[PDB]
Amino acid sequence: QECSLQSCAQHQPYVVDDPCPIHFYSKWYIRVGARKSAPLIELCVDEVGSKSPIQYIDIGNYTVSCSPFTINCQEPKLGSLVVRCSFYEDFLEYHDVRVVLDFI
Amino acid sequence: QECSLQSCAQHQPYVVDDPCPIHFYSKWYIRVGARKSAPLIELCVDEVGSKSPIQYIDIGNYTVSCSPFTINCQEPKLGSLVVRCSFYEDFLEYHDVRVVLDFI
Ligand SMILES: [Ca+2]
Ligand SMILES: [Ca+2]
Ligand SMILES: [Ca+2]
Ligand SMILES: [Ca+2]
């Protein structure tokens, strides 16, 4: 039920305002199709050497940097941009915030 | 509040939760292309008159009813869904809330 609306210059890099509290841990995902039954694809944990039959790639450099989290300012197409927030490093209790973009 | 996140079953009718305070006046818009520099197109205008210069009518199935405002649960392609909330009937002091959908 929590939503973060942010404005950025379309087609240019955008350092996202992380909506989690500043001392909370944050993990970034795409919820495929913005559907709750669909997978949460974790964004900034890419280890090479996957042999999975399903692999996610970044043709257009949607994710520009992981530190700090920076995206190309563009309409989400695979699904919704979602950050998961926790006081605990192990994410024992967490809340998810969707990040929505208005274009300047 | 700038962002309202709501859940509905995709392609089924959905009565949109008005995120404005219950005693506030509210008008529904599409913001073309989700761009701040684009026009707001007012939805569900009853009749052209002193309060509404132009009646906009969708040619497809996005709007199910205008009383109460009911959509076919989907994200709009023309732009973002925005509600303008005002304590006053003249809409001189107001705030806009963007409505976005998670799909069941
Ligand atoms: Ca922040
Ligand atoms: Ca943070
Ligand atoms: Ca309400
Ligand atoms: Ca209302």
Residue numbers in the entry:
A (entry chain A), B (entry chain B): 18 to 121
Task: Pull verbatim passages from the article behind this deposition.
ORF8 is a viral immunoglobulin-like (Ig-like) domain protein encoded by the severe acute respiratory syndrome coronavirus 2 (SARS-CoV-2) RNA genome. It tends to evolve rapidly and interfere with immune responses. The full-length SARS-CoV-2 ORF8 is composed of a signal peptide (residues 1-15) and an Ig-like domain (residues 16-121). Herein, we determined the crystal structures of SARS-CoV-2 ORF8 (S84) (one of the epidemic isoforms) and the bat coronavirus RaTG13 ORF8 variant at 1.62 Å and 1.76 Å resolution, respectively.
To determine the sequence-structure relationship, we next solved the crystal structure of the RaTG13 ORF8 Ig-like domain at 1.76 Å, in which the electron density of residues 18-121 can be clearly traced. It is worth noting that there are two molecules in one asymmetric unit, which is different from SARS-CoV-2 ORF8 (S84). Protomers A and B form a dimer via an intermolecular covalent Cys20-Cys20 disulfide bond. Similar to SARS-CoV-2 ORF8, the RaTG13 ORF8 Ig-like domain folds into a “β-sandwich” containing two β-sheets (strands βB, βD, and βE compose the small sheet; strands βA, βC, βC’, βF, and βG compose the large sheet) and an insertion region. However, the insertion region forms a dynamic loop in the RaTG13 ORF8 Ig-like domain, distinguished from the β-hairpin fold in SARS-CoV-2 ORF8 (S84). Unlike SARS-CoV-2 ORF8 (S84), the residues 62-78 loop region of RaTG13 ORF8 is assembled different conformations between the protomer A and protomer B in one asymmetric unit. The electron density of residues 63-65 of RaTG13 ORF8 is unclear, indicating a dynamic region. Additionally, the RaTG13 ORF8 displayed a similar two-stranded parallel β-sheet in protomers A and B’, like SARS-CoV-2 ORF8 (L84). SARS-CoV-2 ORF8 (L84) was the strongest, followed by SARS-CoV-2 ORF8 (S84), and RaTG13 ORF8 was the last.
